[PDB]
Amino acid sequence: IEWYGPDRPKFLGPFSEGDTPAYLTGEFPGDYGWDTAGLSADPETFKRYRELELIHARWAMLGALGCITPELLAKNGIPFGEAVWFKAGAQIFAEGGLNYLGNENLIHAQSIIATLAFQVVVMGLAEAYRANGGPLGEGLDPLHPGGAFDPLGLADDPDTFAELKVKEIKNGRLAMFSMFGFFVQAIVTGKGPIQNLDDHLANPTAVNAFAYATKFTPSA
């Protein structure tokens, strides 16, 4: 395994030698040679698309975590009102309000306007500092700053920094694909994805996705 250069692990393996793009060399992390749609021909579109991919990846990682750890954590102990992720916004409208750990003494969140207003105000300057400038650094790598973001300092040697970049982008593409799976298997079942996992593990042959295949057929 190399993850760079011309002999890299590619998305079709043996079927990837004639498909492989001429604009897609072995430079950037995660380049499996997959631009069959042709959307990275000029390098600044590829730069904005790599930035888009890494930001969507790093958001979908924490999105999958905030998806399954309420449901798993409610399965272990610590019961909630609406433990599933895609009813989790409805806990503001509850008579007891959204709570972080469910207990009544933490936050007492009854307002949706205050939370949304505060997070918009703080993330305006946060994502603006992400775009350019900021007190933690201005002219760094805009996708991989480091410095005031690395208390442990795992970007010391360029070899382990490069392999951390490729496992970052691979875990993030897995998280984006699985978050797409969370999105679609929420709406075809109406039930939680960990509860979908136990439903699949109870009956693998007939409680799979194909039981919900006749659901979306149009009426009349």
Ligand X SMILES: CC1=C[C@H](O)CC(C)(C)[C@H]1/C=C/C(C)=C/C=C/C(C)=C/C=C/C=C(C)/C=C/C=C(C)/C=C/C1=C(C)C[C@H](O)CC1(C)C
Q: What would the x/- binding string for ligand CHL be over residues 127 to 146, using CB under 6 A?
A: -xxx---xxxx--x--x-x-
**Residue 67 within binding range of ligand X, rule CB under 6 A:** yes
Look at phi and psi of residue 154 and say left if phi exceeds 0, alpha if psi is from -120 to 50, else beta. Answer: alpha
Residues 124-183 that bind other proteins (CB under 8 A): 125, 128-129, 131-133, 138-139
Q: Looking at 17-25, 37-45, 112-120, 191-199, which segment touches ligand CHL (CB under 6 A)?
A: 112-120
User: Whose Cβ is closer to other proteins: residue 171's or residue 185's?
Assistant: 185
Nearest CA among 55, 7, 53 for reference residue 33 = 7
**If you ran DSSP here, which 8-state letter would residue 25 be given?**
-
- In whole angstroms, what is the distance from residue 148 CA to residue 146 CA? 6
131 marked as part of a ligand binding site: no
CB 74 within 8 A of CB 198: no
- In whole angstroms, what is the distance from residue 202 CA to residue 48 CA? 44
- In whole angstroms, what is the distance from residue 176 CA to residue 168 CA? 12
Q: Looking at 23-31, 62-70, 154-162, 189-197, which segment touches ligand X (CB under 6 A)?
A: 62-70
**Residue 123 within binding range of other proteins, rule CB under 8 A:** no
CB 70 within 8 A of CB 88: yes
Residues forming the site for ligand X (CB under 6 A)? 34-37, 39, 56, 59-60, 62-63, 66-67, 85, 88, 176, 179-180
Residues forming the site for ligand CHL (CB under 6 A)? 9-15, 32, 55, 58-59, 62, 86-90, 92, 112, 116, 120, 124, 126, 128-130, 134-137, 140, 143, 145, 149, 173, 183, 186-187
